[PDB]
């Protein structure tokens, strides 16, 4: 199907406790494959997936050098942002950045991304055209003016249409055992009485990859959107994900309730009911 590659970066300042901590991770779809942490003993980018281990030592040296350079630029940017927002030097602040590409089944570019956030708020983003910017405020307009002057979007566009797509295709081939395998969810329905009058039906989905999934409860064929408790999809820790959806039903009406499961690994959407 479709695929994505993303690099996430976070710098967090800590006045009086040294220089900002910098952590970056890279993902293909929902699979972590590289990491870098400036607080590590001897900071290097390290493999986190079997299929990336085969890259040569040149790959790791160049990747490590890019990470270290980003860490230094983030440190200067954090200093800059204090000025843009007329802030004290006493508090801890956050700079986040994501970039990457999406490709379709034919491996052709669907769209690229490059976005920043300051203190958890949208700051500046590359537009879908890969040539213009959207600045969130007057501070970010100064950054936009700088980036426009230095032809930043042009270099980004070249990366996103070129190496991002080409290396994502390479990663998909080298890790095709796992990256191109969808593990369907294992499903079951549980029943927990809460009183004499009502009970909780919980629809479970376990052991699935990728994370994207739809779990819905229906009563007499209508979606129980407003009365469904739906927890965030969560990682099991072995590559797979988990999710459940619960509904409170009047006792004796359990059979009117059906759980519906949509996942990429399933040829047909599943319909489940509780079995006493």
């Amino acid at each position: 199907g479709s695929h994505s590659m993303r690099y996430f970066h976070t710098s967090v300042s800590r006045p009086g406790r040294g220089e900002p901590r910098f952590i970056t991770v890279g993902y293909v779809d929902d699979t972590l494959f590289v990491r870098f942490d400036s607080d590590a003993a001897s900071p290097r980018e390290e493999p986190r997936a079997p299929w990336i281990e085969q890259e040569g030592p040149e790959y790791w040296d160049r990747e490590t050098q890019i990470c270290k350079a980003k860490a230094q630029t983030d440190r200067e940017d954090l200093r800059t942002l204090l000025r843009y927002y007329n802030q004290s030097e006493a508090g801890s602040h956050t700079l986040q950045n994501m970039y990457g590409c999406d490709v379709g089944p034919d491996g052709r570019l669907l769209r690229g991304y490059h976005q920043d956030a300051y203190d958890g708020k949208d700051y500046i983003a590359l537009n879908e055209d890969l040539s213009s910017w959207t600045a969130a405020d007057t501070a970010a307009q100064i950054t936009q003016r700088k980036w426009e002057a230095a032809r930043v979007a042009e270099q980004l566009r070249a990366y996103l249409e070129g190496e991002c797509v080409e290396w994502l295709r390479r990663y998909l081939e080298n890790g095709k055992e796992t990256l191109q395998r969808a593990d369907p969810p294992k499903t079951h329905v549980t029943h927990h009485p809460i009183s004499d009058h009502e009970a909780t039906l919980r629809c479970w989905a376990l052991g699935f990859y990728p994370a994207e999934i739809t779990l819905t409860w229906q009563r007499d064929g209508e979606d129980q959107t407003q009365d469904t408790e739906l927890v965030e999809t969560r990682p099991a820790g072995d590559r797979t994900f988990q999710k459940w959806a619960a509904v409170v039903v009047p006792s004796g009406e359990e059979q009117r309730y059906t759980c519906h499961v949509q996942h990429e690994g399933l040829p047909k959407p599943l319909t489940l009911r509780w079995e006493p």
Partner: peptide, 11 residues
């Protein structure tokens, strides 16, 4: 593979 920008995109 990561994007090589060499600090040119300072905020």
């Amino acid at each position: 593979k990561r994007w090589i920008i060499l600090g040119l995109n300072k905020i």
